[PDB]
């Protein structure tokens, strides 16, 4: 039957004590390659993906960026795709909180980074892809938000305890 959007939880720890579940829904309707991206790396079915992995940058009032389950300091990451993979679309726009967008490193260099916005970023528009937004546990970004600062380093150690699908 019809696609139906995949939901992936990450369950987060900071310093390794268990902090909450957030849960997105990815919008493979939209961008459906970037989201499989996603999907596959919050399962780990392709033997690699983000469970263990950390949030490197997080910068109150803006956003949270993880996906760097390589080098655990924004310089490493890989898409599920053998190569950095292309820029989908832009047709959805960061809007506000929850929002879960792409990192990049210039046009058609998508990896496996992510960020989770705290805020509208719209000045990213039509440059990041944004592919899924938080569906349950935005208190739980909110919660790690608290533990960055304003260049971004955190102050105790954010975690994907683990991840994965659900119904
Ligand atoms: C611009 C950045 N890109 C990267 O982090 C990439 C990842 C490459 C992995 N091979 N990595 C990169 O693009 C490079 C480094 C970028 C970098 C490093 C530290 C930063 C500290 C703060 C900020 N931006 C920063 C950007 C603020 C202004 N913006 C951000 O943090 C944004 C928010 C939206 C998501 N995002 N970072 C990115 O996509 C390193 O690789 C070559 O190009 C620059
Ligand atoms: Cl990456």
Same mark, same amino acid.
């Given at each position: 039957?019809?696609?139906?959007?995949? +939901?992936? &939880?990450?369950?987060?720890?900071?310093? !390794?004590?268990?902090?909450?579940?957030?849960? /997105?829904? %990815?919008?493979?309707?939209?961008?459906?390659?970037?989201?499989?991206? &996603?999907?596959?790396?919050?399962? !780990?079915?392709? !033997? &690699?993906? $983000?469970?263990?992995?950390?949030?490197?940058?997080? =910068?109150?009032?803006?956003?949270?960026?993880?996906?760097?389950? +390589?080098?655990?300091?924004?310089?490493?990451?890989?898409?599920? $795709?053998?190569? #950095?993979?292309?820029?989908? *679309?832009?047709? %959805?726009?960061? +809007?506000?909180?929850?929002? %879960?967008?792409?990192? *990049?490193?210039?046009? *058609?260099?998508?990896?496996?980074?992510?960020?989770?916005?705290?805020?509208?970023?719209?000045?990213?528009?039509? #440059?990041?892809?944004? /592919?899924?937004?938080?569906?349950?546990?935005? *208190?739980?970004?909110?919660?790690?938000?608290?533990? !960055?600062?304003?260049?971004? #380093?955190?102050?105790? #150690? =954010?975690?994907?305890?683990?991840?994965?699908? %659900?119904?």
């Amino acid at each position: 039957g019809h696609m139906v959007n995949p +939901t992936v &939880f990450f369950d987060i720890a900071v310093d !390794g004590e268990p902090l909450g579940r957030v849960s /997105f829904e %990815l919008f493979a309707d939209k961008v459906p390659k970037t989201a499989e991206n &996603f999907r596959a790396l919050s399962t !780990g079915e392709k !033997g &690699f993906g $983000y469970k263990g992995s950390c949030f490197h940058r997080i =910068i109150p009032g803006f956003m949270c960026q993880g996906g760097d389950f +390589t080098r655990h300091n924004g310089t490493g990451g890989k898409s599920i $795709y053998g190569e #950095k993979f292309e820029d989908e *679309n832009f047709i %959805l726009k960061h +809007t506000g909180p929850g929002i %879960l967008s792409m990192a *990049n490193a210039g046009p *058609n260099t998508n990896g496996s980074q992510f960020f989770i916005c705290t805020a509208k970023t719209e000045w990213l528009d039509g #440059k990041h892809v944004v /592919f899924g937004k938080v569906k349950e546990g935005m *208190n739980i970004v909110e919660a790690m938000e608290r533990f !960055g600062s304003r260049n971004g #380093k955190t102050s105790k #150690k =954010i975690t994907i305890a683990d991840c994965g699908q %659900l119904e």
